Symmetry: C5
Subunit: 367 residues, 5 copies
Amino acid sequence: GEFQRKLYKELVKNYNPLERPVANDSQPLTVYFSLSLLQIMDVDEKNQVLTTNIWLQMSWTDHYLQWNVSEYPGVKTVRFPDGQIWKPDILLYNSADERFDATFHTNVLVNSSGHCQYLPPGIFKSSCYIDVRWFPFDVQHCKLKFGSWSYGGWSLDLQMQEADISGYIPNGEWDLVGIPGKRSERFYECCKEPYPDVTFTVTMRRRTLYYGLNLLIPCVLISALALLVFLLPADSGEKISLGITVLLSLTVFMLLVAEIMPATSDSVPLIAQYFASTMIIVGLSVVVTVIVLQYHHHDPDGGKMPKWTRVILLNWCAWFLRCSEWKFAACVVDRLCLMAFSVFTIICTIGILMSAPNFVEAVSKDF
Amino acid sequence: GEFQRKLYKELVKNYNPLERPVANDSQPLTVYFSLSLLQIMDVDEKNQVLTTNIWLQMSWTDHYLQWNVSEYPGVKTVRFPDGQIWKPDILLYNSADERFDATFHTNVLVNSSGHCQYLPPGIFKSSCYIDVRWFPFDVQHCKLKFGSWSYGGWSLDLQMQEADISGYIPNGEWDLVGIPGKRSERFYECCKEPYPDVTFTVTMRRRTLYYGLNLLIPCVLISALALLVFLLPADSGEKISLGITVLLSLTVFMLLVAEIMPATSDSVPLIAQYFASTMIIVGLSVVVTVIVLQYHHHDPDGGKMPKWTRVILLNWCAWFLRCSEWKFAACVVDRLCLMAFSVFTIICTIGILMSAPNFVEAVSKDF
Amino acid sequence: GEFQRKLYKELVKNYNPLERPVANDSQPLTVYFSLSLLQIMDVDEKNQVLTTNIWLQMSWTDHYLQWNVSEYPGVKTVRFPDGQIWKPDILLYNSADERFDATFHTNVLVNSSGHCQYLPPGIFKSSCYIDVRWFPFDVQHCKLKFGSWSYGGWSLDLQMQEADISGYIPNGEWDLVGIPGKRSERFYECCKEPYPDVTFTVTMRRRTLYYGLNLLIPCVLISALALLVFLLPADSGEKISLGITVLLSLTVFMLLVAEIMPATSDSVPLIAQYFASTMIIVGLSVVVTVIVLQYHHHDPDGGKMPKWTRVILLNWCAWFLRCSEWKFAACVVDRLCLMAFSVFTIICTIGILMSAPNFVEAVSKDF
Amino acid sequence: GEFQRKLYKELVKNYNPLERPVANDSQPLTVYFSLSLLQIMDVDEKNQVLTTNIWLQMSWTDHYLQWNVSEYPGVKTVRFPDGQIWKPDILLYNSADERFDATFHTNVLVNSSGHCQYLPPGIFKSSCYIDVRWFPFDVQHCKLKFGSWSYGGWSLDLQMQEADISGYIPNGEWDLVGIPGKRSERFYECCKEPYPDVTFTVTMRRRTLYYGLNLLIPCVLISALALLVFLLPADSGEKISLGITVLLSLTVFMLLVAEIMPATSDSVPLIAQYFASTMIIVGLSVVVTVIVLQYHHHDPDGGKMPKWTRVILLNWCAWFLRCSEWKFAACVVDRLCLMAFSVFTIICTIGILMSAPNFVEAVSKDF
Amino acid sequence: GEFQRKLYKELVKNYNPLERPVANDSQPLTVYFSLSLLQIMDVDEKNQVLTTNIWLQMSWTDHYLQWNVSEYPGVKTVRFPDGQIWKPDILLYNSADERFDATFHTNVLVNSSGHCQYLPPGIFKSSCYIDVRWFPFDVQHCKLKFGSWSYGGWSLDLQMQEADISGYIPNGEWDLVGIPGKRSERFYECCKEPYPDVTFTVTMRRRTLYYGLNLLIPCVLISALALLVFLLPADSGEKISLGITVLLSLTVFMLLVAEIMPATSDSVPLIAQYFASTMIIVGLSVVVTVIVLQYHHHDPDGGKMPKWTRVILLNWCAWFLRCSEWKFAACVVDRLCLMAFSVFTIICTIGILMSAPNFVEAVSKDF
Ligand SMILES: *[C@@H]1O[C@H](CO)[C@@H](O[C@@H]2O[C@H](CO)[C@@H](O)[C@H](O)[C@H]2NC(C)=O)[C@H](O)[C@H]1NC(C)=O
Ligand SMILES: *[C@@H]1O[C@H](CO)[C@@H](O[C@@H]2O[C@H](CO)[C@@H](O)[C@H](O)[C@H]2NC(C)=O)[C@H](O)[C@H]1NC(C)=O
Ligand SMILES: *[C@@H]1O[C@H](CO)[C@@H](O[C@@H]2O[C@H](CO)[C@@H](O)[C@H](O)[C@H]2NC(C)=O)[C@H](O)[C@H]1NC(C)=O
Ligand SMILES: *[C@@H]1O[C@H](CO)[C@@H](O[C@@H]2O[C@H](CO)[C@@H](O)[C@H](O)[C@H]2NC(C)=O)[C@H](O)[C@H]1NC(C)=O
Ligand SMILES: *[C@@H]1O[C@H](CO)[C@@H](O[C@@H]2O[C@H](CO)[C@@H](O)[C@H](O)[C@H]2NC(C)=O)[C@H](O)[C@H]1NC(C)=O
Ligand SMILES: *[C@@H]1O[C@H](CO)[C@@H](O)[C@H](O)[C@H]1NC(C)=O
Ligand SMILES: *[C@@H]1O[C@H](CO)[C@@H](O)[C@H](O)[C@H]1NC(C)=O
Ligand SMILES: *[C@@H]1O[C@H](CO)[C@@H](O)[C@H](O)[C@H]1NC(C)=O
Ligand SMILES: *[C@@H]1O[C@H](CO)[C@@H](O)[C@H](O)[C@H]1NC(C)=O
Ligand SMILES: *[C@@H]1O[C@H](CO)[C@@H](O)[C@H](O)[C@H]1NC(C)=O
Ligand SMILES: [Ca+2]
Ligand SMILES: [Ca+2]
Ligand SMILES: [Ca+2]
């Protein structure tokens, strides 16, 4: 309108996008970098990649994009696309995206004082170490490391502002504890110039109820069936079939769990160790029961001729609770297996009750 | 043709795409923003992202793209590609797309009065909160928030026009109740200039029959089997195997349901709670029946020696309906479990009959 | 070669790609639009999107790209890339692609008379309504709607030529009946100028044998098992287990079918209704048999004390074919269920034998 | 270095990338097209698309990119990016890629004689007809059709050179027999100018052992179980359950096979026909055995009253090998079913032993 | 700031990005190429493609990008985007990416001496031969081959620097042994000019515990069940059903294994051969037991009439350990099958204990 056109013509008369916009070349350019978390799209524990929906916020002063408001009435701000003016090269250092730059290059808003505002949105994919050991009561500290790609501390004085979380959409699987930020420096051996960066640590807590019932109901059922087969009579007929079916069902369930979560060898989840203990206990009990039944139902003394087993079973039954002796030995072994399974379940429950994600507090908040 | 070429040469003589095309720089530019919904591609409840096929509609007046029709006979409209002329930076604020701009940049149609028309098509992916609690009788209000990225109310006077739905292709899984629109403002603490935006709320109702039979037939079958095992005699032989098989089948079905829909911890679906109640009832009944049978078939009084259980069962049988006492106690427990399951089914049906998506009206319209 | 270089320099001396190449600006530009179908990549019934491999064919006369062959010996054609010259903005209106333009922008072939040829290949993804109701004997009419995005009938006189199918690679799942074309106009209320478009209707017939055996063999097996359990004696022992296993297997098969095809609520497939009828019949028969066996094996008259059931069963047995009465009643009920299942199977076969995709003709052509 | 810079400035003084670089415009430009296969990424039998990793090789002489080596000491070659100089528009005609051009546009290497070298790498996706009928002993001839998009034989004299396979990485699922090439012409009715193209036929043989054990072990097991149930006594008790379980397992296996490979209706695989024959035989045998057992175990003559069945069974037993007659008839039927299954297995093995991929030679080479 | 702008204007006065920046054109340009491995994203054994997160490091001296620091106070470094200055065309030769260039083109950092630094990040997908034969104790040597695409050894003197691994994030499935580098030359028959390249061999060891328990627990269970059925009495009733169920479960497990890993025919994994041996042993044992039971339970001598079998079984029982003879023969056959299975398990364990990935050392380090 005879003023905006003239201003746009005048501002880019000799402007060079490659030049860092400072009046004095030996002075640093202060850039205020902030963040606006909006949504946690995905937490891939397989590839250790966190996907988030983030609006970056960058602000700096341009020495050449200044004008007198009185000389250009009615126009107070101008917009420049990607390549028209200089922008800081703030990139996510730990970006796992195949493009390495998920930001959408919007226009830079500059007002009459030369203050530029740049808010590039994007779906950032950052590679963070997923420590899945206290499954499912685990908290992940995924870091977002931002910094200038080719500017030092004496050229781009990067500064930090607290991230904005008043736009956040709850994920439904992870609970956002918070996203604190920190500014650190990267002094090199070559040179005394610092290399600042801004790191935002997305502290997230896994929501219990998402996997809670879906894993507890099968686990409760298989534990009840294990107790049942540890209490059923030896000569019941269906005990062997029930045990085999239970083992097949729970190993298919464990295969499904390993398909959903990754059973990373860096730190085996405690649930996997509990399952392994249950498997070895159930297998030993079933093998002992089957061999006793198949070696003592037809021959009264076919496998009972060793003396060491007889004396050790007598000592164990005297130290534990005190048709032939084979039935009593099988019952004692089954009771011992039941006691061991109960002790393991109790100790696992005790060890999982206390943790950094307080189980009692979590269930009180959820339920 | 000696007139279109001359007009195109004349129109871009001093035109600047960065300049907002207003005769007076202090006056707002009125932009009419409308929408044309065509198809609902996908409703991802996992990532809370809605995918739609939408044709945007933007209209504004350009002060510099005006010409005299008599001076240029035969030409009444001109087209300019993406970067040739100025276009409003209307973007989907809640876009979850990795590109953040799904629009296809078509040509801007300008006629002799300077009126520009811009209709960019695209497959928009917006992040909306999916409240899946009354599954499957749920209605989702997914919002599409459009607004200028870097213009205020005194620069780009955004206006709303009612969305066009006379091109809509039915989804087959979701029923489109409607897409009302609203224009709101975003006054900041810094400044009195409003920041208008246009929000279209895609109100969608899940079609019943899509998941209806596929979830009812397994649910009806498992409920019938639960009633059967709650009515079968205790000493039937196959009762334990039937119960275990039923539990395995329905827990696999629940795993499939959790695979298809997300069991979000924000609000657990009522179907999940009903399944949990059925699971606890069936497990308790099976455990009680098995323990009674295994502790009373060989010993007439091996687990019946406690007095509290005997007196409480006598009181319950006197207050409910009034071979040894163990069979009668097992029958009473089984009848109580059947009654509890029937009451839970009835109350769940009553609570799910009434809702915002009226169940009776929905089935009347569908069937 | 001193002539091609000179011609290329001369042709683009004042050429404007934005100008429509007509000698008279008030005269329409005739553009002949044709199509060359090559392959049907995918038919997504979930999102209602058809993916095809298509070579477009556009021809028009350019007034400015003309030269004298004698003055430029040896050169008869020239090529111009995307942005060098004017091309019609013919786009797929119902494109479901995220880019909205799957065409690969090749060079435009222009000869000495100004006749331009443009053949952009691409993998088009168009959104067509998939009416899957007569599964698997269904024919889909997916339309490809092409037209100018910003030109009317008095500016771009779009014309149609018959599509070329002598390059088509058979899909193996769908049979191509044909792709007829049609040209229609879109008169607006504003103005009398028509808005022509060219629509190609890809009429495709699903090949029977692809899903034929894969669905018939499980269906034949489950139908045979249903007849078997409807003919087996009540006191056989394995009847209940066989029925439960059959129901579980066929409901898993129906889950697989719903996973492969979409059970759209717009029109439920007839196979789904047949499965629902079979399910209700089998469930009723199994429930009746189980309740009769469990209420009459131990008590000669425990559930037979009502008079209405006895008299109605006597009337039914007198009107149908004419150890205690319970066995005869169970046999009569089982025979009635078998007869109902046979009638339903016969009527379903009769109703599916006749259709627009003639079943007898299809199997004669395939087998 | 005062010579490379001068040469680069001089070479592009009047160079036009649109001009075909020939001294005489009426003379063809000879382009030598070769190929360098590196890896067969994927063979999609569903969409009939072959994915390969290929380095193209194009060579031609540029008349204008010539210089005197003595006048420019030290520089013998120059490089030009995509748009700087002219390149042939050699494209894969049958490309199924959504971009239609998988080549990565590298620099063109030109030496002092004007000879240009262009080696664009890419991951080509070509649509070839997959004839999967002799599964798994099948050989696929997938063609790669390359040619100029807009040049005739009198403008671009395309020539063929033998493909290079000394970089090939074995796929592990397909064995590369060879990739012969051929040059053909495409004379049109309009004009006598030929339209040459270069076609490379990727002849590939499926490696036996990849699917060999994975399909043979289930097939061997189900065949052994079929023989077992065809040899087990009728009154064994578990015969019906074993047969039903075998049928369910093998139909799930066939569902898995149809999920992995496509059961295309163009030509049904022989394995599918063998499975159908086995299914009908097993179903008939099971139905006959069950009906005989259920109609003759309680009534000595309840279904044996027809005379035609009795006389035909007497004739068959006299012509085949020569408690009541029902057991003998059931045994004769079971033996006949076993003989039919054995004959079908033998004839299938004989017919699959001989083929273009010689089974004996293949197993000798592999084992 | 009156110095950076002047320097940027002066540096690109006559700069040509196509020219190789050397003072003398006949002298090679030394380029130091290094690598910085950060993460191993994926190891696809199906397509033989390795996905890694890598920061490249390239350094070279530019003759024209030099300036006097005193003449331009305060500015010591400059940045140029992709197309502004010359960069080496170092590409991954064995790249399997569809783009062939995963690098993100950042700015080139040049200081006053003309020394340029280029650090392009990217997610590289390279095609390496995956030799999966000693599953799961296998080490993969995946090579990353980098080199100039169109420069010889006398033009681009490529040099190697040791890769940096102090940023590496552990994968959790693969253990990084190391990434040694090597520089080699590619002399051609045409010419004596070498063609150097830099190859980094990513030596990776599969972590045991990732698949360890998940494959051992099913394998241990099926081995225990095989021993059980090889020790159970012949006339146990459930032996046949248990064997069939075990076979079905383990063949489903093998199908799952073939789904996860590829059973490549180049070299069959030892686990597959062990499974095949177990399958043939179990099948033979089950068939022999079933045929003996079905041919000797009703007829004392119905299949024992041959003399060769009787004499060979007598010899075997005399050479092995020394109701009718059929039971003793069945027991001897079952014991022989058990012994063969035990020998095969022992020899497989012995052969898998020793390997390049030392099993004992690996389990000592992990456990
Ligand atoms: C241009 O925009 C900047 C944005 O920061 C304005 O700077 C702010 O001005 C207010 C005065 O109302 C101060 O309270 C803030 O502290 C300033 N922020 C910073 C970072 O300096 C600046 O005033 C604007 N220019 C004009 C002419 O209005
Ligand atoms: C250019 O196009 C605009 C499109 O809006 C025309 O403006 C409309 O003109 C009609 C008159 O037939 C009015 O009824 C509408 O209310 C106008 N709409 C708006 C938004 O102003 C305009 O007339 C066209 N110019 C010419 C010269 O025809
Ligand atoms: C340029 O190409 C066009 C292609 O259509 C030629 O026009 C055709 O010419 C033939 C004469 O051999 C006629 O039979 C066709 O009917 C014409 N087609 C159309 C659409 O007009 C044209 O002749 C070519 N120019 C020259 C100089 O050869
Ligand atoms: C430029 O490169 C071409 C590449 O082909 C050279 O042409 C080859 O030259 C050799 C001589 O050593 C002949 O044996 C080949 O037959 C030629 N090939 C072709 C296709 O003509 C050419 O000599 C090079 N120019 C210079 C000046 O060395
Ligand atoms: C420009 O950067 C290069 C980076 O290598 C500098 O070269 C290094 O200079 C140091 C002196 O402090 C030497 O120890 C290294 O050996 C040099 N490296 C190489 C590869 O030559 C160079 O000095 C810098 N220029 C200026 C003016 O500081
Ligand atoms: C802006 O212009 C006014 C006159 O229009 C003048 O008084 C004022 O000093 C100017 N400001 C600057 C910063 O030049
Ligand atoms: C357009 O031109 C005609 C003469 O050709 C003139 O009468 C008319 O006033 C002009 N209109 C405008 C708006 O300049
Ligand atoms: C082309 O040039 C020839 C002479 O070379 C002339 O006779 C002829 O008329 C010209 N044609 C046109 C259309 O100008
Ligand atoms: C190249 O230059 C030399 C002199 O430097 C001259 O003798 C020779 O003829 C020239 N070659 C050509 C092809 O012009
Ligand atoms: C740089 O400039 C200073 C004077 O400012 C001069 O003494 C010195 O020699 C110059 N260096 C070069 C390399 O030209
Ligand atoms: Ca996840
Ligand atoms: Ca499909
Ligand atoms: Ca494949």
